[PDB]
């Protein structure tokens, strides 16, 4: 059944699983036409497919050309997501295929189930968690490879950099969800917190800065403060 606060440690066991977030697949700018009507212009998108235990990210870039001459794009986007996730699973060796796929949005269940009929032993699950994977496009290097793509492309990342050398998957996921929650609530503020000290750089092969264990505690505190403040403002409490 649904993944929730109750069964959270299941994310970090030895059963291969992937989260799939379709938030950033179909992206548009809304604008005025010459005649004063409204139109959309699609921009490049991405499927965010993440192994929460290992940090392996399968970033499938969705090039605007996939929408050309199609109708009902927000519906098609769920089906295209399920088609690409299915293609990814089929591309993996049997021992690397997931035992579960957790979709961040319930509207992905039927599309993914129908595309995965050939894999009856892969469980397709929803979640009660409100995960902040929509904010993946606030990670500069992920935003940069999506926006520069001139054709459909899969790019592989480790969204935890080298953190698993020092911390557990549980702690790595908690840090990732805190960073993305901050980036989602107040992007400008979050990004200032992460880069304010110019002596701490991002390695060419990394997404996030090279914080020491002590700097991560300071950073993580700055992010929690950012989130609580913004909450008081949102709700006037």
């Amino acid at each position: 059944g649904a993944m929730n606060s109750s069964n959270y440690a299941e994310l970090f066991n030895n059963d291969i699983k992937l989260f799939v977030d379709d938030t950033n697949v179909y992206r548009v700018t809304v604008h005025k036409t010459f005649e004063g009507n409204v139109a959309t212009k699609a921009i490049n998108g991405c499927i965010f497919t993440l192994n929460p235990k290992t940090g392996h990210l399968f970033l499938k870039i969705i090039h605007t050309s996939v929408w050309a001459g199609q109708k009902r794009l927000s519906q098609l986007a769920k089906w295209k997501t399920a088609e690409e996730v299915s293609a990814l699973v089929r591309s993996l060796p049997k021992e690397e295929q997931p035992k579960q796929i957790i979709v961040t949005r319930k509207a992905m269940l039927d599309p993914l189930e129908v595309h995965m009929l050939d894999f009856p032993n892969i469980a397709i699950r929803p979640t009660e968690l409100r995960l902040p994977f929509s904010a993946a496009m606030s990670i500069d290097k992920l935003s940069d490879v999506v926006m520069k793509a001139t054709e459909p492309q899969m790019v592989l990342f480790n969204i935890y950099d080298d953190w698993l050398d020092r911390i557990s998957s549980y702690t790595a996921f908690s840090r990732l969800t805190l960073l993305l929650r901050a980036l989602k609530t107040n992007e400008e503020s979050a990004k200032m917190i992460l880069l304010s000290d110019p002596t701490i750089t991002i390695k060419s092969y990394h997404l996030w800065p090279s914080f020491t264990d002590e700097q991560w505690i300071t950073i993580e505190s700055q992010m929690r403060d950012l989130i609580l403040t913004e909450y008081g403002r949102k709700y006037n409490v």
């Binding site: 098609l76 089906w79 399920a82 088609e83 039927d110 599309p111 189930e113 129908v114 595309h115 009929l117 050939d118």
Partner: protein, 300 residues
């Protein structure tokens, strides 16, 4: 005009014959049902006064043999049996008629209800859904599960309805996942109509049989099958015009006949709302939409 004699009525029971029903008292001198219209299947059904649980009954066609009912005090039910001796049977029926110990099938001349509910229902198809090949008639009750319900446990006592599953390889062509899921025309027309049923008459016959088992026995798996067969048509963009017109007549008479008090358990809100208001065929079922909106506006 055919007859189903009863040996006796040793236990108090409500007896149904098609859409009609009669209360019979313990040891009431009741000896059966006469003037049964030839040309249709019929169902004779029972509900004991002491156990309003297990509605049960028998689908039969008087053209196929001479049938009677006899109570079995060991198995504790009214059983249908075939009399192979034509002259013994004719002599039993003539005696009971002369003593007027039979109820008359109470058809009004104007009234096409039973024809309309059984138009496509064939005894030879019933006997493939309900497998008991040594009898010419078919036993159904409230508790019998379907082949589909069993997959998800005694195979001999199952209702072998055609399995319909919208999220199955049968329903979804590799490479047409979104197309086949959102428009079930290939599943309806190629897989089910051309492939399995062979024609729309056999499809409607199974749909009509599933409804009647749902209504007369409160058979839950039958209700599931009736709704799945409606939803497969309503969820297809491409349906022959004659099938839509016929489905509207079929459903109209089913909704017309349904006891007003059973709409809550026998009608699936989601399916009917989807079929009448969201589906490809939302505008193709005029008679059905009008009787549902006037008889069951709460459900919608």
């Amino acid at each position: 005009m055919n007859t189903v004699p009863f040996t006796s009525a040793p236990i108090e029971v409500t007896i149904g014959i098609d859409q009609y029903s009669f209360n019979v008292k313990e040891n009431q001198p009741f000896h059966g049902i006469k003037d049964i219209p030839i040309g249709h299947v019929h169902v004779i059904h029972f509900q004991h006064a002491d156990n309003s649980s297990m509605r049960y009954g028998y689908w039969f066609d008087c053209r196929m043999g001479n049938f009677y009912i006899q109570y079995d005090p060991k198995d504790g039910l009214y059983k249908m049996m075939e009399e192979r001796d034509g002259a013994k049977f004719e002599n039993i029926v003539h005696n009971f008629k002369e003593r007027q110990m039979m109820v008359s099938y109470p058809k009004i001349d104007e009234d096409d209800t039973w024809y309309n509910l059984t138009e496509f229902v064939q005894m030879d198809k019933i006997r493939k859904i309900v497998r008991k090949d040594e009898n010419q008639f078919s036993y159904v009750d409230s508790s019998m599960t379907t082949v589909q319900e069993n997959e998800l446990s005694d195979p001999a006592h199952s209702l072998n309805y055609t399995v319909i599953n919208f999220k199955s390889r049968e329903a979804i062509r590799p490479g047409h996942e979104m197309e086949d899921f959102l428009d079930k025309s290939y599943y309806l027309n190629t897989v089910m109509l051309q492939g399995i049923f062979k024609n729309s008459s056999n499809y409607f016959g199974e749909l009509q049989f599933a409804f009647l088992n749902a209504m007369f026995f409160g058979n839950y798996g039958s209700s599931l099958q009736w709704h799945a067969m409606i939803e497969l048509i309503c969820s297809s963009a491409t349906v022959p015009k004659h099938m839509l017109d016929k489905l509207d007549e079929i459903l109209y008479y089913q909704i017309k006949t349904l006891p007003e008090q059973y709409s809550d358990i026998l009608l699936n809100e989601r399916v009917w709302n989807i079929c009448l208001y969201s589906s490809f065929q939302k505008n193709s079922l005029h008679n059905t939409e009008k009787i549902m909106e006037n008889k069951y506006p709460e459900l919608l």
